[PDB]
Design an enzyme around this catalytic site. Sequence first.
Site, PDB file in Angstrom:
ATOM      1  N   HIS A  61       5.432  31.372   6.137  1.00 43.89           N
ATOM      2  CA  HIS A  61       5.389  30.514   7.344  1.00 43.89           C
ATOM      3  C   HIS A  61       6.666  29.658   7.399  1.00 43.89           C
ATOM      4  CE1 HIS A  61       3.590  28.230  10.608  1.00 43.89           C
ATOM      5  NE2 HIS A  61       3.725  27.104   9.925  1.00 43.89           N
ATOM      6  N   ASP A  63       8.671  26.965   9.485  1.00 44.45           N
ATOM      7  CA  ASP A  63       8.664  26.023  10.619  1.00 44.45           C
ATOM      8  C   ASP A  63      10.124  25.798  11.118  1.00 44.45           C
ATOM      9  OD1 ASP A  63       5.962  25.096  10.779  1.00 44.45           O
ATOM     10  OD2 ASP A  63       6.272  24.467   8.702  1.00 44.45           O
ATOM     11  N   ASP A 175      -0.931  28.410  12.434  1.00 43.45           N
ATOM     12  CA  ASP A 175      -0.687  26.987  12.235  1.00 43.45           C
ATOM     13  C   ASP A 175      -0.874  26.011  13.400  1.00 43.45           C
ATOM     14  OD1 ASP A 175      -0.520  25.039  10.173  1.00 43.45           O
ATOM     15  OD2 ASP A 175       1.617  24.801  10.415  1.00 43.45           O
ATOM     16  N   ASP A 312       3.903  28.445   3.111  1.00 42.18           N
ATOM     17  CA  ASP A 312       5.112  27.891   3.762  1.00 42.18           C
ATOM     18  C   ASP A 312       6.397  28.237   3.013  1.00 42.18           C
ATOM     19  OD1 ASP A 312       3.161  26.634   5.382  1.00 42.18           O
ATOM     20  OD2 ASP A 312       3.994  24.610   4.952  1.00 42.18           O
ATOM     21  N   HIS A 442       5.036  24.089  17.051  1.00 39.11           N
ATOM     22  CA  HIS A 442       3.893  23.228  16.759  1.00 39.11           C
ATOM     23  C   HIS A 442       4.246  21.974  15.945  1.00 39.11           C
ATOM     24  CE1 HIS A 442       3.968  26.376  13.608  1.00 39.11           C
ATOM     25  NE2 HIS A 442       3.669  25.367  12.816  1.00 39.11           N
TER      26      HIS A 442
HETATM   27  O1  LIG Z   1      -0.593  19.903   8.062  1.00 40.15           O
HETATM   28  C1  LIG Z   1       0.045  20.608   9.113  1.00 40.15           C
HETATM   29  C2  LIG Z   1       1.479  20.890   8.749  1.00 40.15           C
HETATM   30  C3  LIG Z   1       2.175  21.600   9.913  1.00 40.15           C
HETATM   31  O2  LIG Z   1       2.482  20.513  10.793  1.00 40.15           O
HETATM   32  C4  LIG Z   1       3.512  22.302   9.628  1.00 40.15           C
HETATM   33  O3  LIG Z   1       3.949  22.969  10.787  1.00 40.15           O
HETATM   34  C5  LIG Z   1       3.512  23.154   8.413  1.00 40.15           C
HETATM   35  O4  LIG Z   1       3.540  24.523   8.777  1.00 40.15           O
HETATM   36  C6  LIG Z   1       2.531  22.662   7.303  1.00 40.15           C
HETATM   37  N1  LIG Z   1       2.437  23.039   6.008  1.00 40.15           N
HETATM   38  C7  LIG Z   1       1.508  22.298   5.405  1.00 40.15           C
HETATM   39  C8  LIG Z   1       1.002  21.416   6.294  1.00 40.15           C
HETATM   40  N2  LIG Z   1       1.599  21.634   7.490  1.00 40.15           N
HETATM   41 ZN   LIG Z   2       3.762  25.184  10.707  1.00 36.81          ZN
END
Ligand SMILES: OC[C@@H]1[C@@H](O)[C@H](O)[C@H](O)c2nccn21
Ligand SMILES: [Zn+2]
Length: 1016
Positions: A61, A63, A175, A312, A442
């Site tokens: 994932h 971001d 997500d 992530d 997001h």
């Molecule tokens: O808790 C939500 C957040 C998201 O805002 C973020 O986009 C991300 O992908 C993420 N990894 C762990 C936690 N989170």
């Molecule tokens: Zn995210």
Amino acid sequence: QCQDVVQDVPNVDVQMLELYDRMSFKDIDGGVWKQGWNIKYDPLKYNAHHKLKVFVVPHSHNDPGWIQTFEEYYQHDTKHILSNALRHLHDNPEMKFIWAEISYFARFYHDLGENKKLQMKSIVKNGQLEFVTGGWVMPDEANSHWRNVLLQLTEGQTWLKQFMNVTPTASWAIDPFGHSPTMPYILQKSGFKNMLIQRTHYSVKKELAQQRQLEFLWRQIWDNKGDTALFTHMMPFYSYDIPHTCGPDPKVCCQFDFKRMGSFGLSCPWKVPPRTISDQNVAARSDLLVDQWKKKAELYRTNVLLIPLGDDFRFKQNTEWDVQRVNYERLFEHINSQAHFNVQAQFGTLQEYFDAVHQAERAGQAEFPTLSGDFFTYADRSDNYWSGYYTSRPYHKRMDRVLMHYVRAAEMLSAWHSWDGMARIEERLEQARRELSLFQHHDGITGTAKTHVVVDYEQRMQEALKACQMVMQQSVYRLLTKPSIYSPDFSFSYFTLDDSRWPGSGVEDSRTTIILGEDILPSKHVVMHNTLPHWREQLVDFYVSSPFVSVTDLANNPVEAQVSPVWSWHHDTLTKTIHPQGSTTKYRIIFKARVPPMGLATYVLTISDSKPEHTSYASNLLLRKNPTSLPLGQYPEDVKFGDPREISLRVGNGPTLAFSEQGLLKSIQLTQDSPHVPVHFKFLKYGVRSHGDRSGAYLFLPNGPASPVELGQPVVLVTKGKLESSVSVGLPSVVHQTIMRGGAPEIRNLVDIGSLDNTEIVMRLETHIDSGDIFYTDLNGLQFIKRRRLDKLPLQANYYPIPSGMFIEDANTRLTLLTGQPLGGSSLASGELEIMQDRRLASDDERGLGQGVLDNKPVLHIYRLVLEKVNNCVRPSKLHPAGYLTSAAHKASQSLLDPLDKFIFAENEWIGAQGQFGGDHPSAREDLDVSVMRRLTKSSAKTQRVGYVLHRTNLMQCGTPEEHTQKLDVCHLLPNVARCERTTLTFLQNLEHLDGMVAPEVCPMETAAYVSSHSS
Ligand SMILES: OC[C@@H]1[C@@H](O)[C@H](O)[C@H](O)c2nccn21
Ligand SMILES: [Zn+2]
Ligand SMILES: *[C@@H]1O[C@H](CO)[C@@H](O)[C@H](O)[C@H]1NC(C)=O
């Protein structure tokens, strides 16, 4: 022909509003599966002839901005992930990997030399690297407008088709914080066949899992037939990480995340580390893992099981690729060769999983339930509802909607011509589309990124706005100048944009004053653009250096105008009041502009030495104790003063509004004979809990119902004009304005939460409408969904996204609040609506951000307030899950989201100026919009192509006779049409070659795309 979207209640297996009404919501300890139960399976379910087929789907994932900026993450993490992915997939033919975020992939690919590009293309063509969704980002689903959802999907998919020759048909949304049916709506019309979602309320997961309703055909709430349906898979557990994707027990699943053994920092919170798979332990380990899979498989209807494998920014280090791959390969070899397991497990991609599920469905192995509704408001645990991000960082929420309109306008304005490459039109439009697309992330529009990341998004959106301005002003010059006189310099500013509502009076002094004078320049051309496909009239205003200005059209016909002072508000820390000052050097001129469909109209402002015949002057009244004078330079009417008192105003034939002595609306009377209907504005504040869980960027955890903001004796400014009147009041943290131009009022709030830490400011409307527990909120600007306040849920759970509007109604009366920015809101009591304006939180809410929200800046929120008699309207029945706007409320929404654009000619004389563009454009029915008009080809293409997206909303029938209107055929808007095709909404696939090159209009609630090809 068309489905009735009002009068037939669809029959679905699960209707989310109905399910919420029945469901318990109790937060009960389920055992190892904390929010579920102890899953049991029958070991003899699977056998030699019926094996569990398991697809393990590696992912990462990424971001595009959150804790680091997009570029920071790219340099530190994503460039490595993608480089290593390329190498490891190429070297290991059975390894698979899915990728979602095309923004990073395009960033990467364009740094690659040819050898690596070729290698990349080969791992995509052989199915090892599969793109899922294919959007620029993985968008927020609460705050995003559907037009921007479609923009960022089109940006990513057009890039994929051009560079990778692929178009994804499976979507992956692991997500976003809650999920909207706008996604399957757009996806289904863009060639998708399947979708995956993850963040739904834990209670809903437990409820659907109990019934094996985690995979369903998700149709729109008004869809009786089911042609909108898209097969959806909801993941069952608390997270998309490895501990929550292998099965119900994270203490076990964590043992199969091989990045958690120590050298990568990471560890298992459940206290048992992964161990390398060897011959001495493969049997035990396999037992453990298959038992988890067979438990997870119990929640689904087919013998095909999806196991995501990632987290992530995973798959970054070469050693991580090896440790995950090698250990899973050892498991697969053992498991697949042990007949007693009756499992065949392998790495797979998402499309492989869905292909296998549908094969099982086709073999008659399963039938799937149908579902409609949405999945807001999400809670991941206990009473932790993620309704905070519906408001967080509202400056940027508003900026999103401003940029949305300017991208649409610039693409439409510049689409009418082909442009020489030297104009850099395509380059500038690409940059603007990509910055807006990025912000749909997001952690972008949601306001859940770190302060410095928010600044990065803001700077990128500022650059996008400038790019749009450049394109629009060059386009206007070209469209309104005689062709034999048109002499462009593509780096020159022929016009500047004038925007009255962004950043907004009191936010930034960004508006240029038109300087005119008898001894200098006597007059100035201004131009208005109307992006909507029907004739439109709207009051527009300009700043001018003299009050003695007359307006004409370009046939020299006088235009009625009104001049008003320029009022700004200041926290007068000397007198300790928030009070207005009038300008002594500039004035506001206001007039009605009438502009063709998707076209332009030119007006002229001309100075005179005294009052002009057709210009009137507003009166002004300042209501406050202990007034002092307010000089206004040359303005010809003196400000009047008075003690605070109730006042009443009416513009045109429009409603009469009454105000409290605090300058807040108290009532609205629609017609001269009708009743004064109580409609009261009030400002309140929520606080934060002192003990237990703290509100942050994501979560709203109020310490109780909101308390009234103490107003004191605020200063009230009243302006009364023939065309526009207003009441403005300086309240603590908010300058609140009600504006009247003859129909529904406009509300503007300049919100400056200052240093009120741990506070959320809410605007509430209190009425006597007998709405009960029902209210309606929009989803992505596309549809309105029925909500029901439930006392079994806490206050913060009854907050929903308000991305464009909300309403309450009873049998006779409706109050609709349209917004120019997405915010959070609710109806917490019968007759009330409320909408959060800003929030300043000094604590982290433990969702990984590691900071509160303390970077607030003044923001101008804009609204329209529409009170309507609705006893004559044809409305859905009580069991229907949708609502629909009236024509008035829909037009009011359009006034906020897509106002006329205003341009001021930048030099002294415009040689060759023309009065209008688009006078011959058809004026379409009011429910039809051309949401997108975009030229798809560069100027060298022999066959030019233009894409259009048409959307028809559904408006309530209330007995106003429908007017005559012209059919809109987008395929004939440009000359020399040679073909007209209906396409997917991204323009990437031809669906139908159209007879006579005529594009038909679309049904209510439908959206279609067409591409016209032209001989050039
Ligand atoms: O808790 C939500 C957040 C998201 O805002 C973020 O986009 C991300 O992908 C993420 N990894 C762990 C936690 N989170
Ligand atoms: Zn995210
Ligand atoms: C693109 O993919 C299609 C499959 O639809 C294939 O037939 C074609 O060879 C590919 N085109 C190019 C230019 O690689």
